[PDB]
Ligand binder design. Structure first.
Ligand SMILES: O=C(c1ccc2c(c1)OCO2)N1CCCCCC1
Length: 149
């Protein structure tokens, strides 16, 4: 799989994160990110995808060492961590054929796993609208604990 790059944008209080909602196969909420172009550097791809999906330019704010990276079914996803972005910032996606909505969410209220169906004696997991975000939540909380306490 081709690697994806994007960002975790936090507000000034460090309580809230910015998620985007896609369409169809991507119909739920996730961090902004997308596939790298041939010859494109990781930091440039992250700024390009976040700008297409949110209208906000991160280029002057990226720190090269500050990111969370996960491998999900053999595709690598790297999200640069971007704190301190005010909640009154005006976000407007570029690619509105791909992005339904853009909203701030409370980090303490977001799930860090889906729920099972053991009350129904049935295997698998119940649907969750945060499915794309969920794998990053626990690693984010651990990262913020260490850097900020
Ligand atoms: O998370 C993604 C995404 C981007 C590229 C992908 C992908 C997922 O899976 C395989 O290639 N996006 C894109 C727009 C939808 C809302 C969330 C952000």
């Amino acid at each position: 799989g081709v690697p994806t790059y994007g960002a975790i944008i936090l507000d000034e209080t460090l309580e809230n994160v910015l998620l985007v909602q896609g369409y169809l196969a991507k119909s739920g909420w996730g961090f902004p990110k997308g596939k790298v172009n041939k010859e494109e550097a990781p930091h440039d791809c992250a700024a390009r995808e976040v700008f297409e999906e949110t209208g906000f330019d991160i280029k002057d704010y990226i720190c090269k060492d500050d990111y969370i990276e996960l491998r999900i079914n053999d595709q690598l996803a790297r999200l640069y961590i971007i704190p301190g972005i005010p909640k009154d910032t005006k976000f407007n996606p570029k690619t509105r054929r791909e992005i339904r909505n853009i909203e701030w969410f409370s980090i303490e209220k977001l799930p860090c796993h889906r729920n099972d169906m053991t009350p129904k004696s049935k295997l698998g997991l119940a649907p969750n609208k945060f499915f794309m975000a969920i794998p990053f939540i626990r690693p984010l909380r651990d990262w913020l604990s260490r850097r900020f306490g």
